[PDB]
Design a protein that fits this description.
The complex is a heteropentamer.
Chain B lengths: L6 E12 L4 E10 L2 E7 L5 E3 L5 H9 L1 H22 L11 E6 L9 E10 L5 E5 L9 E3 L3 E2 L5 E9 L6 E7 L7 E6 L1
Antiparallel strand pairs in B: 1-2, 2-3, 3-4, 5-6, 6-10, 7-11, 8-10, 9-10, 11-12
Chain D lengths: L4 E3 L2 E5 L4 E6 L6 E7 L6 E7 L2 E5 L7 E4 L6 E5 L9 E7 L9 E2 L3 E6 L9 E6 L2 H6 L2 E11 L4 E7 L2 E3 L3 E3 L4 E2 L9 E10 H5 L4 E8 L18 E8 L4
Parallel strand pairs in D: 2-11
Antiparallel strand pairs in D: 1-3, 3-8, 4-5, 4-9, 5-6, 7-8, 9-10, 9-11, 12-13, 13-18, 14-15, 14-19, 16-18, 17-18, 19-20
Chain E lengths: L1 E12 L3 E8 L2 E7 L4 E4 L4 H4 L1 E2 L1 H21 L11 E6 L9 E10 L5 E6 L2 E2 L5 E2 L3 E2 L5 E9 L7 E6 L7 E5 L3
Antiparallel strand pairs in E: 1-2, 2-3, 3-4, 6-7, 7-12, 8-9, 8-13, 10-12, 11-12, 13-14
The chains are: A mainly beta, B alpha+beta, C mainly beta, D mainly beta, E mainly beta.
Bound molecules: 2-acetamido-2-deoxy-beta-D-glucopyranose.
């Protein structure tokens, strides 16, 4: 079983 | 040293578990130069600005319905999943402590002496340390250093008892930990 | 790392329901994508499945997901000829890269109301001596087989939709360099219906 | 309505040469991709790109390929020295979010054909076949048949033009062309198309019918030493007017 | 009954340093070596019972790098206020002569996550057996770090732990000796 990464999102430009 | 100025960005995904996977709360945290700017709280349901700096980010991230529905379901797809992956070696981790009783300084009988009980290399941190004089518990004159996290999935604590030892006295340290079914006992004779 | 789809090609009658499987890894699941890829067009995303057991609907197309077993089922309720496309599935892990399957090439056979099979002769716009044979208006049940000889060329059945007057026609083209080739013996290699009309 | 665009539709290159495949990914997208599909093979990943850097790449990549982001519009894939095996449909994709949880928008594709020698390249010979008089009376409809023959490789875009405007209704072209010599490996192809109109429409002599075929061949910079005409990227057509009889 | 799992990430400029790690109740489950592009399990046992795709972390760091540039400009280039550490030196278990033990150096309550740590046996730097944790998270958004030194206790030998941080003018030196 794999540990999952909560994917980061880019900030407002 | 290095006079150059620094700029720090910290990201944190907190998975709060209450009675296992019964109640779960996700906390997506954005931190710039130790100050938290914006956060996602699963209880809230959308991105919310902590400080003024995080205001354009809470606005933009709430506009993206995909990311928002993705994040709401994350309590199951990410939190509850990662719990199950580790459970056997993380939640259910049991490491038996090494208990040792020794006096602070070799002192003669009828004179003031401090006894030390050292509980070391145990997991989890929940531990119950009790002192006994001659079968009955001694609640008074007890001093604890507190729980120390070693950083290698082990803990340590030192519990002390202020004593005036006498001939017949046989002091004993009782340690209650989930790794053992019956309490651990190490005795010291005066 | 490995995604499989079965079958590679699938033929289904107009109005009939159709389903196709997609097998992907049972671990490290992030997302499962479904793409509709029409001939000469760009593959367009139908579904991006992220939650296990969650069913998604996009018109007559439904999709189910089983992350634990590593399978996904796409369903086309009462399939229309416009659905004739290659349906690809892709598995997304922690990254952004997609691992594609073989893809199920769906061909929706049209319902031919009132079939009138016939073989017609076409004259070239520039030359009178140059001609072409056309087997048309036959129902979806009739198949067009290839030519035995290397000098005679026969194309496969092609569906044309006259959007205006609401009409669908099946057609096949045949031509040969050698003049000892005629319409009556052009499509004879295929199982031609008894009602097939021949002029003069 | 925004789309990932790719130019050209098809491309011919001699073995050993350097090929630059151009793509215009959606303006506001954070991730750009390159995928390829060899005939009778799966769509394989090549490279993913985010914030002027390669995110993920293939084992085959780096040794054989490179990517460049020059302007704030174009994104390009470069094939160092073209191999016979590099002949595939090249897809350029792009996704909006940096978290990858979103769909990937695919380009139309660029069919690259790598040949040992460009001497086998041939443009098509377009011809329009007028409908049968037997069809006009029997069905009360008229089928026009176009024919593009003797072309190599399968770099053909057929289109029907009625009264100077492109038509799609009652139009059907073969998805796959047939080989003129099925025994040969470098055999020339033949493709047929159909255009069905009302009998009264074909009978009007004012109505114009033209079959346009766009071929993707050689360029003016490519060396041509043969006696025959240069098989350059050209449009070959055939026309026919309405016949009243 | 109450447990917390934290996916803690950071990116720091102009140092161009980034770290990704998972934390179960204060203890590091694993981290990602950015240079090697590999998952590094805190206890080798974890690697036998679980797996992790390093790319997920690499993708997140790329975003953190971009997000940092955006926030740096947004704050009108406001730098981080230096917070000096609280160094504490202790042992794995009670000290006993000629019995192998481990000296623990606990660098705590600091920011930014940049520190120069040196173990010193009798004034001379020591490297044999030395191990260390990554920059561990704190509820106040500061950092925790652990430095380890396996050793054999002797009355003659004396140990120290020199810790350099921009928050403090002179390096913190925490001594240790047998009594
Ligand atoms: C660590 O040491 C290097 C080399 O002496 C120095 O450039 C840097 O400023 C030091 N960093 C800290 C945090 O003291």
């Amino acid at each position: 079983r794999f540990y999952k990464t909560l994917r980061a999102e880019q900030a407002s430009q | 040293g290095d006079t150059r100025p620094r700029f720090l960005w910290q990201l944190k995904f907190e998975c709060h578990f209450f009675n296992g996977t019964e109640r779960v709360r996700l906390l997506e945290r954005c931190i710039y130069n130790q100050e938290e700017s914006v956060r996602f709280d699963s209880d809230v349901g959308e991105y919310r600005a902590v400080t003024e700096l995080g205001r354009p980010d809470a606005e933009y991230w709430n506009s993206q319905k995909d990311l928002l529905e993705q994040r709401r379901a994350a309590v199951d797809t990410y939190c509850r999943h990662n719990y199950g992956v580790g459970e056997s070696f993380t939640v259910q981790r049991r490491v038996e402590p090494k208990v040792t009783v020794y006096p602070s300084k070799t002192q003669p009988l009828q004179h003031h002496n401090l006894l030390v009980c050292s509980v070391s290399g145990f997991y989890p941190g929940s531990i119950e340390v009790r002192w006994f004089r001659n079968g009955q518990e001694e609640k008074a004159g007890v001093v604890s250093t507190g729980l120390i996290q070693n950083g290698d999935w082990t803990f340590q604590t030192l519990v002390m008892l202020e004593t005036v030892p006498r001939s017949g006295e046989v002091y004993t340290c009782q340690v209650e930990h989930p790794s053992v079914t019956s309490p651990l006992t190490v005795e010291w004779r005066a | 790392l490995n995604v499989e789809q079965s079958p590679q090609s699938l033929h289904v009658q107009e109005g009939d329901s159709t389903n196709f499987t997609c097998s992907f890894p049972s671990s490290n699941f992030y997302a499962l994508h479904w793409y509709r890829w029409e001939t000469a067009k760009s593959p367009e995303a139908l579904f991006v499945m992220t939650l296990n057991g969650d069913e998604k609907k996009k018109g007559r197309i439904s999709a189910t997901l089983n992350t634990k077993e590593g399978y996904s089922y796409l369903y086309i309720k009462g399939s229309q000829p416009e659905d004739s496309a290659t349906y690809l599935c892709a598995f997304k892990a922690a990254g952004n890269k997609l691992t594609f399957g073989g893809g199920t090439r769906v061909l929706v056979k049209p319902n031919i109301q009132n079939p009138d099979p016939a073989v017609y002769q076409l004259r070239d716009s520039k030359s009178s001596d140059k001609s072409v044979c056309l087997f048309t208006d036959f129902d979806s049940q009739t198949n067009v087989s290839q030519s035995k000889d290397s000098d005679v060329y026969i194309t496969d059945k092609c569906v044309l939709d006259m959007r205006s007057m609401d009409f669908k026609s099946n057609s096949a083209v045949a031509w040969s360099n050698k003049s000892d080739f005629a319409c009556a013996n052009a499509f004879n290699n295929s199982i031609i219906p008894e009602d097939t009309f021949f002029p003069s | 309505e925004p789309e990932v665009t790719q130019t050209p539709s098809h491309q011919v290159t001699q073995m050993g040469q350097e090929v630059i495949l151009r793509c215009v990914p959606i303006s506001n997208h954070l991730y750009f991709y390159w995928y390829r599909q060899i005939l009778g093979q799966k769509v394989e990943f090549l490279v993913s790109f985010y914030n002027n850097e390669i995110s993920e790449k293939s084992e085959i990549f780096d040794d054989q390929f490179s990517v460049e982001r020059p302007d704030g519009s174009n994104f390009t894939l470069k094939i160092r020295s073209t191999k016979l095996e590099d002949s595939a449909m090249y897809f350029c994709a792009s996704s909006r979010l940096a978290g990858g949880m979103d769909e990937q928008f695919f380009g139309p594709g660029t069919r690259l054909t790598v040949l040992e020698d460009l001497k086998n390249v041939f443009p098509p010979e377009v011809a329009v076949f007028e409908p049968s008089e037997a069809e006009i009376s029997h069905t009360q409809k008229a089928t026009l048949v176009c024919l593009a023959t003797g072309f190599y490789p399968d770099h053909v875009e057929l289109s029907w033009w009625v009264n100077g405007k492109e038509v799609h209704s009652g139009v059907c072209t073969d998805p796959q062309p047939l080989k003129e010599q099925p025994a040969l490996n470098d055999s020339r192809y033949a493709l047929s198309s159909r255009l069905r109109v009302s009998a009264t429409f074909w009978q009007n002599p004012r109505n114009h019918f033209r079959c346009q075929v766009q071929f993707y061949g050689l360029s003016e910079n490519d060396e041509w030493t043969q006696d025959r005409a240069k098989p350059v990227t050209q449009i070959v057509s055939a026309e026919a007017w309405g016949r009243a009889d | 009954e109450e447990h917390v799992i934290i996916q803690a990430e950071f990116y720091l400029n102009p140092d161009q340093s980034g770290e990704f790690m998972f934390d179960f109740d204060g203890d590091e489950i694993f981290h990602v070596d950015m240079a090697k592009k590999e998952t590094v399990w805190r206890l080798e046992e974890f690697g036998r019972f679980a797996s992790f795709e390093a790319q997920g972390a690499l993708a997140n760091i790329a975003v953190d790098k971009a997000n940092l540039e955006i926030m740096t400009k947004r704050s009108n280039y406001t730098p981080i206020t230096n917070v000096p550490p609280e160094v504490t030196v202790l042992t794995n278990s009670p000290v006993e002569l000629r019995e192998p033990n481990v000296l623990i150096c606990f660098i705590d309550k600091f920011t930014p996550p940049v520190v120069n740590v040196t173990w010193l046996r009798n004034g001379k730097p020591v490297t044999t057996g030395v191990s260390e944790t990554v920059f561990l998270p704190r509820e106040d958004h500061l950092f925790r770090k652990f430095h380890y030194l396996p050793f054999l206790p002797s009355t003659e030998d004396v140990y120290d732990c020199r810790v350099e941080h921009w928050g403090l003018d002179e390096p913190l030196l925490k001594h240790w000796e047998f009594d």
